[PDB]
Design a protein around this ligand. Structure first.
Ligand SMILES: O=C(CCC1CCCCC1)N1CCOCC1
Length: 150
């Protein structure tokens, strides 16, 4: 009973979270997952400020109201070579990664590692935070509040 959560740098408090190395989070699970990091789904304004500070990924993830990819450098295989906060318009499917926003993070680029899952609740799952540099933090708990996500 294990969940891997790959996390990034925080940019103006915004960061990316990928679950189990594949697109696998529903919108309900995404809000619960950010709450476990004492965080919320970013607003579009919060995401645009994060982009302006250096944030980009090559993965679709939820924000409040949309599924997006923040892009700085054009790349043909990331958001069809677009720049800016690219918004997914047409998809058949419902599961993506998520973005999260923590208001207490530093104002600009924070590329230190994540060393805690501060607001997870009691549960049976071994949850492992995996940083880009490979460092890990594990703790037993749960974050999902909706049965359909378990
Ligand atoms: O776990 C924590 C805080 C513990 C430490 C405290 C300083 C920042 C690095 C790690 N967070 C989860 C998601 O990003 C914002 C905060």
């Amino acid at each position: 009973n294990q969940i891997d959560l790959n996390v990034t740098c925080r940019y103006a408090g915004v960061f990316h979270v990928e679950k189990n190395g594949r697109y696998s989070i529903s919108r309900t699970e995404a809000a619960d997952l950010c709450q476990a990091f004492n965080s919320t789904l970013p607003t579009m304004d919060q995401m645009k400020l994060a982009l302006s500070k250096g944030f980009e990924t090559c993965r679709y993830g939820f924000i409040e109201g949309n599924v997006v990819i923040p892009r700085i450098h054009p790349n043909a295989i990331c958001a069809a070579n677009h720049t800016g906060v690219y918004i997914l318009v047409t998809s058949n499917t419902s599961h993506y990664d998520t973005y999260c926003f923590n208001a207490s993070a530093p104002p600009e680029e924070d590329c230190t590692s994540v060393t805690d899952l501060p607001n997870s609740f009691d549960g049976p799952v071994t949850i492992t935070i995996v940083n880009r540099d490979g460092t890990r933090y594990s703790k037993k708990g749960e974050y999902r509040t909706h049965q359909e996500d378990i």
